[PDB]
């Protein structure tokens, strides 16, 4: 009888909720009450990268924190030198519908995917001075939402078919398949040690998965709508999620709870991208109101706004050394702030 | 110019890449874009065959005009998470089967999907081209089956005329943005041939009315 199983599952989730409640002795705000606030953060547009002709949907900084790859619906994947305004590369995609991009940590490969259900990996450091499609990973049923590199041979993707996957690049087969989500997975992030990863879906819940074993370690549910972004804290024991209800939430791995919520009454639109900064003191989040907000991670106050875009901000990133913050919006312009 | 030889060569390479990007964009800005939106295999494959994986693209030419048609009916995902990618499309094409009224009713689902697409917040200026089809088998069924099954509130003759017009008006009344949007209805069929000309005329009418709308007139 399925009713008995449903009742027993209800009992188990009630037990989990009670166990979580038992360990909540003090809130994050109470401990961080006595600390010096960061103050007012003023950032200036050092560079403006132009040349795209459509909506920019994703970007990813390089490991050297100097080169960056950007993807747009124009059908071009542009690799820029960020110190100057030069264009290192301009790759024409086979399918113009691209919604994600990635840059390999070694700096040799670049991956992109979208509505074609196929993740294309291009090799940049080749002979002949040309960029060609190294691999085309297929096997997904829904649109590809994100893709991240572990090394030069392994990749992790998530799709709208409520499924994530770990692929081996050399042989284009799904090495591991992660299932359990009841909604379209929209974002993922890798741990600094590349052993665990969290994924947010449209079922208003995030899940923490183990790469090697392939089973879901943990689940978290505190939101009210679709989750569009996720990112680990630099320490690696916490992460932050952004949803369509204009709220960011900081979950912690060890406490298995949510610690802090960032929201404000004047802001009501959704959130497209969330990323921390070096040392994890600041949290930058883009919004649908054409702006980007900086929150103090320890407290709940707001530090500043990065308002220099004329359309919805679709992606943003912070360098590995924290010197600059790049933002890309639905108008074809990339802006570097420092 | 406080630059080395290699930096100057890199600047030259970037300037050459800019020219190619601009030339590709200018060429890509001269094409007409159509988004095909059916409902439960309601004659979608019939019309794509008459014009000479998740998303399918069909490129063709007619009277010195390049048409690119996107079929996204095989996505089987949440529509609201990727529909905004199709903002700015020149026109939307809707296929409705007239023979499934006897066949949860399929016509009601088609009407609901048409209402959802037409009154969407992204396609507030794009025009919809209707392709009410399967007229022959519709007549064959209406000969021996009344239309009252779908529409209880209907008093009309049980013939092809006065019945297909009722369906056309019912589908057209679902529009709520008549101020900046128009619907072009056509009664095609499996053996019909002049569908491409109808699409061409609708597209050129849309182009003229958009050019005269940008300039401040109209």
């Amino acid at each position, epitope marked *: 009888e399925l009713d008995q199983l449903r009742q027993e599952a209800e009992q188990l989730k009630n037990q989990i909720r009670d166990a979580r409640k038992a360990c909540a002795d003090a809130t994050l705000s109470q401990i961080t009450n006595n600390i010096d606030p960061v103050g007012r953060i003023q950032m200036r547009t050092r560079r403006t990268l132009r040349g795209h002709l459509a909506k920019i949907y994703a970007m990813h900084w390089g490991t050297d924190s100097r080169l960056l790859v950007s993807a747009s619906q124009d059908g071009k994947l542009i690799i820029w030198d960020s110190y100057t305004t030069n264009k290192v*590369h301009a790759i024409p995609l086979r399918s113009s519908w691209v919604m994600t991009c990635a840059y390999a940590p070694s700096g040799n490969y670049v991956a992109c995917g979208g509505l074609d259900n196929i993740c294309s990996i291009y090799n940049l450091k080749t002979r002949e001075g*040309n960029v060609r499609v190294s691999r085309e990973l297929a096997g997904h049923t829904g649109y590809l939402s994100c893709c991240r590199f572990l090394d030069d041979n392994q990749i992790v993707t998530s799709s709208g078919d409520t499924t994530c996957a770990l692929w081996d690049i050399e042989t284009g087969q799904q090495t591991t398949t992660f299932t359990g989500h009841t909604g379209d997975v929209m974002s993922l992030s890798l741990a600094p040690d590349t052993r665990l990863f969290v994924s947010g879906a449209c079922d208003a819940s995030a899940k923490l998965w183990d790469v090697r074993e392939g089973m879901c370690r943990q689940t978290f549910t505190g939101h009210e709508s679709d989750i569009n972004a996720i990112c680990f804290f630099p320490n690696g024991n916490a992460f932050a999620t952004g949803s369509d209800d204009a709220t960011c939430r900081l979950f912690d791995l060890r406490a298995d709870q949510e610690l802090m919520t960032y929201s404000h009454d004047n802001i009501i639109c959704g959130i497209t991208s969330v990323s921390f900064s070096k040392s994890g003191r600041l949290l930058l989040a883009g919004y649908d109101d054409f702006n980007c907000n900086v929150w103090d991670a320890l407290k709940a106050d707001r530090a500043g706004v990065l308002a220099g875009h004329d359309n919805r901000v679709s992606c943003l990133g912070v360098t590995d050394d924290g010197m600059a913050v790049a933002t890309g919006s639905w108008d074809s312009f990339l802006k570097i702030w420092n | 110019c406080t630059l*080395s030889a290699e930096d100057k060569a890199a600047v*030259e390479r970037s300037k050459m890449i800019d020219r190619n990007l601009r030339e590709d964009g200018e060429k890509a800005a001269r094409e007409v874009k159509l988004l095909l939106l059916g409902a439960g295999e309601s004659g979608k494959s019939t019309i794509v065959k008459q014009m000479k994986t998740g998303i399918v693209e069909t490129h063709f030419t007619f009277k010195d005009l390049h048409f690119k048609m996107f079929d996204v009916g095989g996505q089987r995902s949440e529509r609201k998470k990727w529909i905004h990618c199709f903002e700015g499309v020149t026109a939307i094409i809707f296929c409705v089967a007239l023979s499934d009224y006897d066949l949860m009713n399929r016509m009601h689902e088609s009407m609901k999907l048409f209402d959802s697409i037409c009154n969407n917040k992204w396609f507030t200026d794009t025009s919809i081209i209707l392709f009410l089809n399967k007229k022959d088998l519709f007549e064959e069924k209406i000969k021996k089956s009344p239309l009252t099954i779908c529409y209880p509130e209907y008093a009309g003759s049980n013939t092809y005329e006065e019945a297909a017009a009722y369906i056309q008006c019912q589908f057209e009344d679902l529009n709520k943005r008549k101020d900046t949007k128009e619907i072009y209805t056509h009664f095609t069929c499996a053996t019909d041939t002049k569908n491409v000309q109808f699409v061409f005329d609708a597209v050129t009418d849309v182009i003229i009315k958009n050019n005269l709308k940008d300039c401040g007139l109209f």
Partner: single-chain antibody, 231 residues
């Protein structure tokens, strides 16, 4: 990836000639090209350079005015037109490729060369001429400039080429302390702004040849005297 050169031969003084360089196996339309000549016994010497798209063309002062460079992209060919040949123009000519962007490796591939026989610049100096050494030891080669090769952006433009007896020059280290692809890690290079050194840890039987140090800070490009290695 291969380059084949045609032309050369015996030319009477005061005449004219044309040299062709055909590239097959790579994207010839996105690579800048160089013509470099070498005397029968002396060191290498730069001749001319043409950018991608023929936007910029640079000539050496020795043959400035009476030489012409050109390229054809659909046929993937490079042409050199030499006019009013003198007795000093006899040389082996090489057709080198070089692509310029961030992190690129200019002068990575060299042509085969064609022989021709006629009937205010930075001075790069290699004092050493020949070093006799046995295989298995570590060898250091010193190249001294006459100006600060270090630039305001932090890059040091110093290229090291190895030419084996009977073979075209091969790139080893393109910029200062930047090993090229396809060569063993046992080669290394360092410098101190004006004087630079090349170090080989475990010398083998394939390291016999001539080493050249070249500067790319500004045109005209200047080579150095040969530093032969003998067993």
């Amino acid at each position: 990836v291969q380059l084949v050169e045609s032309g050369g031969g015996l030319v009477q003084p005061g005449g004219s000639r044309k040299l062709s360089c055909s590239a097959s196996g790579f994207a010839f339309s996105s690579f800048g090209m160089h013509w470099v000549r070498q005397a029968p016994e002396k060191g290498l010497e730069w001749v001319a350079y043409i950018s991608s798209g023929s936007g910029t063309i640079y000539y050496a002062d020795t043959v400035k005015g009476r030489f012409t460079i050109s390229r054809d992209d659909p046929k993937n060919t490079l042409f050199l037109q030499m006019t009013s040949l003198r007795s000093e123009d006899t040389a082996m000519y090489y057709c080198v490729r070089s692509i310029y962007y961030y992190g690129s490796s200019p002068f990575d591939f060299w042509g085969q060369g064609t022989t021709l026989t006629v009937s205010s610049d930075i001075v790069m100096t290699q004092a050493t001429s020949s070093v006799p050494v046995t295989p298995g030891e570590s060898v250091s080669i010193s190249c001294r400039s006459s100006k600060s090769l270090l630039h305001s952006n932090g890059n040091t433009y110093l290229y090291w080429f190895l030419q084996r007896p009977g073979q075209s020059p091969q790139l080893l280290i393109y910029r200062m302390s930047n090993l090229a692809s396809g060569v063993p890690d046992r080669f290394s290079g360092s410098g101190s702004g004006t004087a630079f050194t090349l170090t080989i840890s475990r010398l083998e039987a394939e390291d016999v040849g001539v080493y050249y140090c070249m500067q790319h800070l500004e045109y005209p490009l200047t080579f150095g005297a040969g530093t032969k290695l003998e067993l």
